[PDB]
Amino acid sequence: GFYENYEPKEILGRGVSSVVRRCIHKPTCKEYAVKIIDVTGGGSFSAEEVQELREATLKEVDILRKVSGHPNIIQLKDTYETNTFFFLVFDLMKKGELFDYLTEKVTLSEKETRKIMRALLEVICALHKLNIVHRDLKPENILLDDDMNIKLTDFGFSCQLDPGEKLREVCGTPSYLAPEIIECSMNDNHPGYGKEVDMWSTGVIMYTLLAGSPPFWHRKQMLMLRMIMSGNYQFGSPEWDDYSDTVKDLVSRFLVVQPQKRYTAEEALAHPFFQQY
Amino acid sequence: GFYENYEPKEILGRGVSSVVRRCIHKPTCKEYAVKIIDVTGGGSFSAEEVQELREATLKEVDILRKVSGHPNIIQLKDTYETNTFFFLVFDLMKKGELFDYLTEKVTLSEKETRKIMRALLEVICALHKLNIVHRDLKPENILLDDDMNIKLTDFGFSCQLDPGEKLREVCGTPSYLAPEIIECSMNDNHPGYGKEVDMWSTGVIMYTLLAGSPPFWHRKQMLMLRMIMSGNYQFGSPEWDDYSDTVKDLVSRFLVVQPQKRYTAEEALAHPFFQQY
């Protein structure tokens, strides 16, 4: 099936239920990246649990097929399935993620940040026109090619919403979580959440590029969550001194607690930071 | 200070507030591993936040100095401090972590598992005699040397308890968390927790080596936490079929919800699995 067509190489990355490796296509001798997903739960899960994970994986593949073709989104080339594993073959990105890049440069400039955010907002705008929420936006899920162009990946928690539908689950990566998803977990009489969670996360990304660290970074998780819930953050000490007031205005429109008042992708691309007159 | 004595190389690992790199000692030309900790919070934290992180780091160094000398614990060689960073120089472990090892072999045998667990329990027994709790036991924090001997590391959340003292904070890695720490977060009138959380985590480690996956592995975090709280797990389908009833008895004595009934390190080393007569 997959091992008769491809040859497995080294580990490029790892997830909760997946391992990402470099692989050679036997026929053409070209290199690709393969996500190996274990639906059986490492050693063993229940049949119910297995079906939940098999249905989550098929929705991932579905969104990947719908968004195919966009120049700044990763391309899924070929999928394979067995009773325990799923194999998703993707284009290989040699310069890795935006997280690795940030680690080497510590902080990025206002000009380099405008480049990346203009591309990222364009992708978000496209997805939201189709009613799709990514739901896991972060530096580790944004890859770079040889020309340093961004390529969005990991659509594992993604959803295409129906007219009227709202999501109720608590999922994501802790320091990028919007406050409405955390609100959802403390009150079972909450209305739900929608596409707006992606804009908060976008804001966390943008602040982290410019300052070197995340806006709501704290040692104790309980206080981190209280800080994100109240929107307690700041552009402090010497760090943000070199930066204009326009970038800071844009970041603060993303970091708004009430989702109905938060900026959208369309509105963010119209801001003076990307130009206005 | 640190850059005048050592030369920095590649990234070997990354944490929430730290980056671990390979480095050459200028004078002797020998290779070491250096943990770079940012107390300033990436770009910027508050003065309060900074002092909390600076005091957490100094306690880490303290425990590292107290436990120094044990053959199966990592050795801290040299520390450096500035206003924003902390530099902790350690012995370099070329074969990496037990997590990377597990990924390549998928599952380990009963005999290979007896080797690792006998060593790990010995270290835990030593620490608990000194009243020290590690509080973050997991495959990613257990390193291997050239002879494949285990070396315990990451004492970032560790504590030496006073006569009578109990801990009240919620910290660790989600799938290895004992139920008493999760109980602590839902009821502010709980008595606290102690050294017993390390034994639960030890149990999660042992099951994960043998089966290939963690005992309480589920897609939705809310249900994962309910599963760990109730102790709902199983030795299912074909996975555990090859294994004896003695290993399974030992794992189930670790995975006990009531901490007063849970096995200790001393008791675990006396079990028939490691020998009895």
Binding site: V16, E169, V170 | V16, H218, Q221, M222, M224, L225
Partner: peptide, 7 residues
Amino acid sequence: RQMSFRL
């Protein structure tokens, strides 16, 4: 580093 989760 930080991974994703499901409650």
